[PDB]
Subunit: 80 residues, 2 copies
Amino acid sequence: HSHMLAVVGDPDFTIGFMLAGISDIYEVTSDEEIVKAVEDVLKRDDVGVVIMKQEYLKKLPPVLRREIDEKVEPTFVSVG
Amino acid sequence: SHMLAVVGDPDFTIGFMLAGISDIYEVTSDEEIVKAVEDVLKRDDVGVVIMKQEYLKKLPPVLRREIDEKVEPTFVSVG
């Protein structure tokens, strides 16, 4: 039971958040890396919210998309 | 100037005001929602707008696809 804020994205997308003191970030580039990160963030029990590019869901297999569709917790926030 | 604006009911927008954000559009009725989004898209100093995911369907496809570009501002939807 913890509600950490995690961010997932390329290094250019992450810096703004790190400088802002957000250390729960997942650096990502490879399509495979995007999907694992999301799998990983879902395996966690301390994440409450996760920021992401709106252009990342498409890259996630049907299972994951619906898996995060429920979105009981963490609440996904997608940067348009 | 790239101001952060937030659109939502007072309960959703309270954690933001407490955190310093003061560019809030307090909306409740389906009607006020569409206006807010229109107003914010009518401004020239808004770089980002936070808003619940459940607010897009409530938008006329013209508008829903006006943020098609999403050039500036960028929209951030909370699921």
